[PDB]
C-alpha cells in the first residue's frame, strides 16, 4: 500500500471530513431557512369561546365560535434581506472551512505515513546496531575463552549490548504506536507500506520566498476565512444601520364568526341586542411602522458592530502575520533539511571510515573496546539522523504546499512516485 | 500518606469535580424548568386607562379601569414534550460527563503521585552518583598528593563532578515542581509519601486485546457520550418533524370592567350611550392553530437536523476510532513497560559488573579515569531508567483500567497495597 | 534595538491587544444598549384596512385607515435593572481581560526576544566548537602528513567535525525560526538586537514566598476574574429571585381613525349605522401584571442560578490553587536558575582546565584524540548551559512579576538596562 492508496482509503471514510461536509450542507439549508420568512406564510385559526357574565352582566352568556385563515407577507423589511445575505456569507465561511480541513486531512495522513516509515527504519537501524555490538561481544568472548584478552572487555561489551537491547524494546514500542496512529487516521490496518528510495532520492530547492509570499497572500485559506469574516462584520454594521429603518407588511384574512347568545337577559330584547350572527369577513390590509426613538438601542448596536468590525480587521491582520510566519518558517525548514541531508551523508561516510579505523586500532592495541562500541553508536546515530532528515524534507515539502493553500491529490501523486518498495509494518 | 489517603483528601475537595457536580445538578433543575410550561400558568392583570377624544370625538373622555385574572394551559403541543425529552437526554449527557471526570480525577491524582515519587528517586540516584564521583575524585587527589598520578586525572574528575553537581541542582528543582503539582491537585502539602516496593514488585501481563476491545465497546464513557449525542440528534430530527404539527390550547379568564365616562358630549344622552358599567366576565375558551405553509422553514429545519444527525454519527465513529487507538496504544505500552523492566534489570546488573571491571582495569592501568566516570554515569542512568520503567508500568495499568471505563477506587486500593514505605518529599 | 524599543513597536501595533481593546469597548457599548430599554420608546403606526363582508355581512364593505403614535415607558420592572447591573459586571470582566492580555503581551515579547538571543549565542558557541575541532583536525593532519601519527586520529577527527557541522546547520535553522517568531510577535524584522552583559550580570534572590503569596492574593488578575465571575453569579441569583416580582408599565398613545363604509347594505340606514368617522384619541394608561404561578419555572431558575453560583465559587477556588502553584513554581525556578548559574560557572572553569589537561596528556601520549574531542564537547555544552541558565533567570524574573500581577513597562526598563551591546540577528 503506497501513499496514494492510503489516501484513497482515508478520504473515502474519514469521520472528521464527513462531519465538516455535514456542517457545510447544514449551512446551505440554513440559507434556505433564512430565505423562508420573506415568502408567504399561511396559518389557520379557530376558536370556541364559552362566556359568562355577572355584575351588570348577570344573565348574559355567550358561546362564540370562530374559524379564520391568515396570510402574512412582508413588503419592505430590510432586516430580513440582511439576514439572508449574512447567512450566505456564513455558508461561504463554512465552505472554506471544509476546504481547509480537506487540506489538513491530506497533511495528517501524509505525516502519519511518514511517521510509520520513520519508526520502521529507526527500528531496523537499532536492530542492526544490536547485531554489530553482539558480533563484537561474541568475538571478544571467543578471544577471552582462549585467554587472549581480559574479562573487562567482555563485561563492557555485555553492558553496551544490554543498553542497546533496551533501546530496541522502546523502538519496537514506538513502531507499534505509530501504526496505531495510522490506523486511527485511515481506519485500516496495513501489513506493509511502500518505503522510500535512497538511491535515486534527490532534493530540489524551493521557490524564492517572495513568490511564496505572493502566492500565500493570494491562496491561503486562513486568510480567506479572515477576509470573509471581515466582510461579514461589515455586513453586521449594515444590518444595525438598517435596523434604523421603518417597516411595512401586508396581511390578508378570511374568517367566519358564529356567535350565539343564551341567558336570562337574552329572554328580553335579544332580537337585535343579543342575536345570533353568521358573520364572515374578507380582510386585506397593510401595516406601517417607524421606530422614532428607542432609547438609543440602535446607536449602541451600530457602535458595537463597528467595534466588532475593528476586531475582525485585527483578526485579519493577525492571520496575515501568522501565514507570513508559516511560509517563512517552512522555507527555512526546507533549506535546513537539504543542508542537513548533505551534512548527514558526509557524517555517515566519515563515521563508517572512523569505525573501521578504530576497529583496526583496537586490533593493534591503540584503541580499546569502548572506542569500538561508541564509534558504532555514533555511526548508527548518524544513519538514523539521515533517515529523519529525509522524512523531514518530504513533510516540509508538504507543509510548503499546504501553506500556499494549493495542497491536493497530485502532490501526493508526485511524492508517491517518490516511494518504491513494500516494507512490512510488523517484523518479528 | 499512601495513595488511598491522598485520593480520599483529593476527591473530598477537588474544585473541578465539584464544578461538574454543580453542572449536573443544574441540568436536573433544567429538567424541572423544561417540565414547567406544560403545567397551569396563572397571571393577574390590571389596567387604568384615561382617555381623551377629539376630531368627531371632542367632548368624549373616559376613565376605564380593569382587573383581570388569566389562566393558560396547553392541550396538544408536541414541541413542549420534545423539549422535555431533549432536556432529559441533555441531563443524561451531563451525568456521564460527571462520571468521566471522576475517572479523570482518579487518573490525575495517580499520575501526580507517581510523578512525585519518580522525581524523588531521580534526585536520590543523582545524589548517589555525585557521591560516587566525589569518592573517585577524593581518592585520585590523595593519589596525586603523594605523586602517584598526574594532574590530568584529578582535573577530569573535577570536571565530571561539577557537571553532576549541576544535574543535582536541576533534579532538586524538578522535585519541587512535582510536589507543587501534587499540592495543586489535592490541596494539601505532604511531608512524606509511601514509596514503591522493589523487592516484591511483580508485573502481570494484561488481557488479550480483543477482550479489552469488547469491554471498551461496552463500557467506555466517551463512547457513551457519543451514543447519547447521536440519539439526541435523532430527537432533534423528531422535534423539527413535530414542528410540522398543529396546536391546541386552553385559556380561562375572570375580569372586571369598571368603565366610566365624562366630558361635554356625555352631558347629552349619556344614559345608554356613554353610561357607567360594572361589567364582569367569566371566560373559558379553546384556541386552534395549524401552520399550512411557512415558506419552507420547517422543511429546511428538518434537513438541518438530518445533516446534524449525520454529523453526530460521524462524531460517534470518530470516538470509536479514538477509543480503539487508546486501548491498543495502552496495551502496547504495558507490554513495552514489562519488556523494558526486564531489559533494564539486566542492564543494571551488567553495568554494575562493568563498573567494577573498569575500576580494576584503571587500578592496573588498562583503563583511564574517564572510563570509570562514564561507566558510573551509564550505571546510574540505567538505575534511573529502571525506576522510570516501573512507574510507567503502574501508570499504564491505570490507563488500561481507565480506557475500559472501569477505573474506580478499588484499583487505587490494589496498587496502594503495592506501595510500602514512607519517604520524605523534601530532603535537605 | 533593545528590549524597550521592541516593546514600543510591539504594543503600538500588536493585533491581539487591539482585538481585546475592541472587545472592551464593545462591552461598554453593551452597557449603553442595556441601559436603553428603561428609557422612553417612541414608535409610529399606520394602517389601511380594506374589508369585505359575506354570510349575514354581505353588502358591508369597509375601508378603515388609521395613523397612530405610541409611547412606552416602564415604571417598575426589576429585571431590566438586573440586566443593567449584569452588563456592568460583564464589562468589568472584559476590562480585566484586557489588562491580563496586556500582561501576556509583555511576557510574550520578552520571551521572544530572549529566545532570539539564546539562539544567537547557541549558534555562536556551536561555531566556536566547530572552529576548535577543525583546528585539532588540521593539526593532526599536519602531524600525519609527516608520518608522526596514524590515520585513525585524523579519521576520528573528521567524524567528530562532520557531526559538529550537522549541529551547526540545525542551530542556524533554530536561529531563523526564532527571529521569525519575533517578527510574528512584533511585526518588524530586526537586523540587530541588544545582547546581555556577562561581566556585570548579577542575580538577586527574590522575596520570601509568603510575601509573594499575599501580593498574589491581592493583585493577580485571574483571581480578580474569578471574584468578578462569582459576584456576577450572585447577581444571576438575584436576577431570578427578582423574576418572581410583579410588573408595572406606562403607555401613551395618539391615534386618528378615518373609517369609511361602502356596499349594498350601506345604501340603507348607513346614517348612524355605518357612517364615516374622523375619530381621534388621546390615550394614557398604566398596566399591572403579577405572575402568581408559572408551573415552577422561577423556582427552577433560582435553583439553577444557585448551582451556577456554587460552580463559580469552585472556579474561584481552582483559580486560587492555580495561582498558588504558579507563584511557588516560579519561586522554585528562580532559585534553581541562581544555583544553576553558579554551578555552570564552576563547571565551565573546570571543563576549560580539563580540556587543557587532556590536550597536554594527548601531546605526551596519556590521552587519545577522542579524549580531546569529547572534552571540547563537554566544555561547549557547559557554555551553552550557562547561557541558557542566564536567560532562564531573566524570564523567571518576568514570570514572578507577572504572577504577582504587577508586570508593566518599568520592569522591561530595568532588565533593558541589563542589556548592553548590539549583536546581529543574521550572521553569514
Residue numbers in the entry:
A (entry chain C), B (entry chain A), C (entry chain B): 23 to 450
Could you share sentences copied from the article?
Colicin E1 is a bacteriocin produced by, and lethal to, Escherichia coli that hijacks the outer membrane proteins (OMPs) TolC and BtuB to enter the cell. Colicin E1 is a bacteriocin produced by E. coli that enters the periplasm of neighboring cells and forms a pore on the cytoplasmic membrane leading to membrane depolarization and cell death.
We recently reported a high-yield TolC preparation by refolding from inclusion bodies and inserted refolded TolC into nanodiscs. The cryoEM structure of refolded TolC alone is similar to the previously published crystal structures of natively derived TolC alone or in complex with hexamminecobalt but with more splayed loops at the periplasmic opening (residues 165–175). There was local variation in resolution within the model with lower resolution associated with the extracellular/periplasmic ends and the nanodisc scaffold protein. The lower residue resolution at these apertures may indicate dynamics not captured in the X-ray crystal structures. The maps refined to nominal global resolutions of 2.84 Å and 3.09 Å for the TolC and ColE1-T:TolC, respectively.
